[PDB]
Amino acid sequence: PQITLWKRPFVTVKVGGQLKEALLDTGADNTIFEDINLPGRWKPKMVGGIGGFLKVREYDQVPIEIAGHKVIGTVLVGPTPVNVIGRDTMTQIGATLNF
């Protein structure tokens, strides 16, 4: 799709079998969800944005269905106020900015 930015750029995503909405976020290096449970081992990580830092779990090689593509990427899980799709996932679907 092509979208303008008059509204928040939410997309519907299936991540580890779980349906979620997430913000296409060109200012986010990684992808982040709250309230999903993913199997297997993970590693601890922290991330920073405005406001401060969020504590997360990092899962590698997780399935993400997004914009008709199936991608396998890293997902961070922690109590973000909104779910975000970062550049790590958007590069895999060839997303571009036009301005």
Ligand X SMILES: COc1ccc(S(=O)(=O)N(CC(C)C)C[C@@H](O)[C@H](Cc2ccccc2)NC(=O)O[C@H]2CO[C@H]3OC[C@H](OC)[C@H]32)cc1
Contact stretch for ligand X (CB under 6 A) within 13-21, 42-50, 59-67, 91-99: 42-50
Candidate residues 35, 69, 72, 82; the one interacting with Y ion per rule CB under 5 A: 35
Residue 58 beta carbon to Y ion: minimum distance, rounded to whole angstroms: 6
Q: Are the C-beta atoms of 67 and 6 separated by less than 8 Å?
A: no
Catalytic residues: 25
Sign of CA dihedral 69, 74, 77, 82: negative
- Specify the residue, 9 or 16, whose C-beta has the smaller distance to a second copy: 9
Q: Which of 52, 88, 93 is nearest to 78 (CA)?
A: 52
Tell me the C-alpha distance between 88 and 99, whole Å: 21
Candidate residues 15, 67, 70, 71; the one interacting with a second copy per rule CB under 8 A: 67
Contact stretch for Y ion (CB under 5 A) within 2-10, 13-21, 27-35, 45-53: 27-35
Tell me the C-alpha distance between 95 and 29, whole Å: 14
- Token reading at 21: 């909405």
**Which positions lie near Cl ion, rule CB under 5 A?**
7-8, 43, 58, 60
